[PDB]
A paper describes a structure:
The membrane-anchored SNARE (soluble N-ethylmaleimide-sensitive factor acceptor protein receptor) proteins provide the energy to drive membrane fusion in various cellular contexts, such as intracellular trafficking and exocytosis. Supercomplexes of NSF, α-SNAP, and either a syntaxin tetramer or one of two binary complexes of syntaxin—SNAP-25 reveal atomic details of SNARE processing and show how sequential ATP hydrolysis drives disassembly. NSF comprises three structured domains connected by flexible linkers—the adapter N-domain followed by the D1 and D2 AAA+ domains. Six NSF protomers come together to form the active form of the enzyme, a homo-hexamer.
Classes with evidence of NSF D1 domains engaging ordered ɑ-SNAP—SNARE sub-complexes were carried forward; eight 21bin20S models were built into reconstructions ranging from 3.39–4.01 Å in resolution, differing mainly in the orientation of N domains and a sub-complex of three ɑ-SNAP molecules and four SNARE motifs relative to the D1 ATPase ring. All classes revealed substrate-bound NSF without Mg2+ needed for ATP hydrolysis and disassembly, and share the same overall architecture, with a spire composed of NSF N-domains and the ɑ-SNAP—SNARE subcomplex on top, the NSF D1 ring in the middle tier, and the NSF D2 ring forming the bottom tier. As such, the stoichiometry of the syntaxin—SNAP-25 complex observed is 2:1, the dominant species in solution. Three ɑ-SNAP molecules bind the 2:1 binary SNARE complex; a flexible linker between SNAP-25 SN1 and SN2 blocks access by a fourth.
Residue numbers in the entry:
A (entry chain I): 197 to 259
B (entry chain L): 0 to 23, 36 to 286
C (entry chain H): 41 to 82, 130 to 204
D (entry chain G): 215 to 259
E (entry chain J): 0 to 286
F (entry chain K): 0 to 24, 38 to 288
The structure:
């Protein structure tokens, strides 16, 4: 009984820690990816804003 | 199954219509209709014909003025060939990778490097080109500061080298990664595991140096003492002093009672035990 | 308690992620339509009893409690993985879409300067 | 480990909320620009 | 610190430049009709002045500059950036005075909802509710703002988002010595989470809260209600909540104060308890 | 091999083309320089690549562009960060100034974090690194990002306690713990921070530490229930009795109970040095 329960608990905690480390690595990768995506989208929105403003002022000057 | 025949006939009719239209300013429409025909074949689930149609559509797109969409079409054609003659898939993925690197997007290039390496090693038995691809991916990722994927590639190549008896590179990679993890507050708990594996690999070179290596690891990382893995390693090291098979066999059985050891770990354990 | 709070807030984050994916698809479609229009413009026991005293008894039960709770913890932990795992894929997908978006506007800008000259 | 993960997940949540706000502004201005372009093209014809 | 003085001086000089530019803009309009360029340019000057004042740590000056920029740009019939400038002014005033922030955010919400931008309006409503709760003891304003934001989010098809607003409203109602509303919200949230695969585990706790707040209205009706909960979520028996509730009921049945106190102390010893639970327990002990 | 030499030759040709085109006298030169810098990076030539990126950024800024010029400056800085810390520092400072002018204060705080990180790890620098951390924490606090601000403040407090007096560390730990008291997630760590404060006082003198721990116990009763309260009481008794043997016994027992991070042990040894 002692061995059964002790090794069962050891296996449970080991699997818990394994999936937790896997999830932490995945979460770090996700954090890097989302930081990149935020940078990319901020740059894209700034670029499109500048382009549309430039087009508006150009058409106003020409019309 | 008449549905497959119907889809094949519809895709062939669409391809014929595309060919007549292109044969009849028309470059853009020709490329678009060819791409639609390739997608129709892909929908029909004819991997060979769909891949051929999509690759000729990619070529015609290259005939059209565009690079980014051209690279997207190259990578999509490589994915389509994935389930076809692997040489064409590999070459098209090389072309897409080169185009992406030329555009400066190194991260996607290294992701495609990993993809090609994995598909090549899983399908074909040769490993050297896959290792080279993984190394190239790690180089780009580290140059771009993508630590996670570069470290994953380094770990993969280290594992392959250890499997290939080139334990020196594997142990060096594991040691550097583990000390870097020690530097960072995060992932340190897992890094010791790498040391354990590395320590096992270390014994493969010789026996007497195992004690010195474990002492160096202990003084470098004192908390590594708490690891039951280190206790098991030292018990087995002491047991190996005598030509007895019962000791280490019972030890590995008891440890396996806790968690199921990886197949590679069992293989290397048997290798060390026998000789 | 911390596990439960993390799981619930991760569920909220996943719903938000789906919402922002829908928003990104809306952005893609609207920008494509605008560009086209603009182009068209142109377990038995746990402790042995060294002494037959009450101090031992509760130990077993105590230990048992923790054991049982760990069981529960298992599902909790596993559950978390699932959620985040799914979210992983979603993020990768949006990347490609985002790329296309910017790429298009790039040439669009050039067009806005190419025809005027 | 749980405490560290909790803090990291909260930071990720704030990151996601900020990205949501940026995307909301982006879509708002995209809709406004779409309306302006539609009006301009319709009236210019 | 020379940095602070230098930043203040340059910000003041740029703000004076903006003021003189707006002043002679009217003269130019009357004389030669330069156009609308002068107003927009003054708008960017005011925004830069506000940013530089913020970098100088003078929040009041930044807020004032944001208000002037908002007014000047709204005169050009551009309401979106006007509301953005009101939001900036409210953020600036947050450190100096938390009252002007309220009206600035109200105006921003009105502008945003004029165009159907209900997301920003609801977020600003939540922010104003939080500001009211932190500053003023008048929980009614926070409740109104929170319920308005929750209604907007429900109209936005945002699931699992207004639920937090409903939970906050329930907590406020329970704190305000009104129980039926909080009990109803708690039970509704719990039964909703029942069908949620993840929130179901937490759902049970919500029931307890309802029961807890249902124990202030009257003892027996709460006890009976537990059965209604107990049948709904039989796993609630496995939790310590059933044991705690039944033991408290048994102790109160015979005025056993010592048992009540000992159980509360032991439960706190297991883990720290929240202020809400302590207040509920204290109020129940009055009987 | 062939690849590096060919890519280097192509980059040289691109630089020559851009130089002659500018001599003909504008953006096309900027894209040519950017492509040449990408060519150098592909060649793995860390040198002459960050310089090319900086030159392209300056050329594009020549026409008042800031966004993409700032991005290219940051790229040059990151490229030179591994090769030459000074060039990366200059590029990061330029990016910080440009984004502060444009209002991207979050980017400025991130660049300050990067500068402080390189100063602590790459260079031998503590004062400027501490100043950069403080500036980044203030910027993040202004941008409603308090987690990184608290982390940087805790790091600065640790550094100050290590090299300077503990008064700054005392204030930082006390304020952080008080803020975390009401915080539900950070409450448990709050006690730890409070605990640290006591240690910071014990190094200075026993009376101040005693008064501080009494104040914390009265204000925050939970700290009493933790093992840290008993450990601090025992250490206080050992110091008061001027019997370093008891201090040593308590330290060994506490180390045996749980592992140490090599910092608490160092502080306790320093305290043992002043016990006399």
């Amino acid at each position: 009984t002692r061995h059964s329960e002790i090794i069962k608990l050891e296996n449970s905690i080991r699997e818990l820690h394994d999936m937790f480390m896997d999830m932490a690595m995945l979460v770090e990768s996700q954090g890097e990816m989302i930081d990149r995506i935020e940078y990319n989208v901020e740059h894209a929105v700034d670029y499109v804003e500048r382009a549309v403003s430039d087009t508006k002022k150009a058409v106003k000057y020409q019309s | 199954g008449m549905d497959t025949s119907g889809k094949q006939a519809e895709a062939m009719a669409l391809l014929a219509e595309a060919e007549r239209k292109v044969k009849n300013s028309k470059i853009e429409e020709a490329c678009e209709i060819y791409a639609r025909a390739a997608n129709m074949f892909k929908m029909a689930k004819n991997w060979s014909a769909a891949g051929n149609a999509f690759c000729q559509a990619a070529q015609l797109h290259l005939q059209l003025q565009s690079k980014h969409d051209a690279a997207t079409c190259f990578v999509d054609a490589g994915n389509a060939f994935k389930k076809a003659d692997p040489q064409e898939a590999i070459n098209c993925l090389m072309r897409a990778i080169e185009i992406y690197t030329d555009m400066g997007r190194f991260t996607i290039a290294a992701k495609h490097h990993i993809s090609i390496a994995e598909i090549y090693e899983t399908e074909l038995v040769d490993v050297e080109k896959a290792i080279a691809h993984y190394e190239q991916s790690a180089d780009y990722y580290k140059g771009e500061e993508s630590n996670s994927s570069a470290n994953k590639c380094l770990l993969k190549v280290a594992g392959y080298a250890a499997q290939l008896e080139q334990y020196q590179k594997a142990i060096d990679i594991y040691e550097q990664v583990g000390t870097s993890a020690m530097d960072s507050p995060l992932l340190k708990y897992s890094a010791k595991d790498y040391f354990f594996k590395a320590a096992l690999c270390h014994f493969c070179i010789d026996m007497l140096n195992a004690k010195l290596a474990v002492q160096k690891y202990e003084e470098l990382f004192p908390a590594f003492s708490d690891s039951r893995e280190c206790k098991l390693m030292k018990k087995l090291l002491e047991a190996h002093e005598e030509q007895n098979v019962d000791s280490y066999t019972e030890s590995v059985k008891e440890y396996d009672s806790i968690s199921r050891l990886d197949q590679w770990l069992t293989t290397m354990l048997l290798r060390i035990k026998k000789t | 308690d911390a596990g439960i709070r993390t799981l619930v807030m991760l569920d909220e984050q996943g719903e938000q992620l789906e919402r922002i994916e829908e928003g990104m698809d809306q952005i893609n479609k609207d920008m494509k339509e605008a560009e086209k229009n603009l182009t068209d413009l142109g377990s038995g026991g746990f402790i042995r009893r060294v002494t037959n005293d009450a101090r031992e008894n509760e130990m077993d039960e105590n230990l048992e409690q923790v054991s049982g709770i760990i069981g529960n913890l298992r599902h909790m932990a596993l559950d978390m993985g699932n959620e985040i795992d799914t979210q992983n894929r979603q993020i990768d997908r949006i990347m490609e879409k985002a790329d296309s978006n910017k790429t298009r506007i790039d040439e669009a800008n050039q067009r806005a300067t190419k025809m005027l000259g």
